[PDB]
Amino acid sequence: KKKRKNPDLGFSDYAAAQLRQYHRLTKQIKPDMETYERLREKHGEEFFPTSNSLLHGTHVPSTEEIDRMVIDLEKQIEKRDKYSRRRPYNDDADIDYINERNAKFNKKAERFYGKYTAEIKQNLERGTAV
C-alpha cells in the first residue's frame, strides 16, 4: 500500500502550473509495448535518432492514435475549464452593490483592503462609535 499527498502552493508563474499539469498528464499515461517494439524492429538503427536524423516529415498516425490524442486533449480541456470553482451565493449577507460588476469589485476590494479597514467596519456596525 502506497500513499502520496500533492497540494499546490500559490500561482507564482504560468510555467510552474504548466509543469504541474504536465507531471499529472505524464504520470497518467500508460504505454503499450507491442506497438513500441513493433516500430523498434521496423525502424532499426534510426529508432534512436539525433537532432539531425532524417525522420522529420514522414510519420503518419493511424486512426486509433489520433483518437487517443483527441480524447486525452478533451479531458485536459475539461480539467482546465474547471479552474475557477464558483463559490456559492448566499443572500443573507447585507448586499453592498447595485450591480453585478459592482459586487465583484467589492469582493476584490475586500481581498486587498479587508485586512486594513477592520476598525472602521467595527465602528460602522457599532454605531459609528470609538
Partner: peptide, 28 residues
C-alpha cells in the same frame, strides 16, 4: 508585486457603490 484597486475620492466612472470603510481608507 500585486497592485490594489484604486478607490478614488473623486471619480466613479461606472457609478459603483463602495462600502464606507473602503471609501474612507485615507490613512494619512
Amino acid at each position: 508585486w500585486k497592485i490594489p484597486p484604486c478607490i478614488s475620492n473623486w471619480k466613479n466612472a461606472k457609478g459603483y457603490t463602495i462600502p464606507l470603510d473602503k471609501r474612507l481608507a485615507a490613512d494619512g
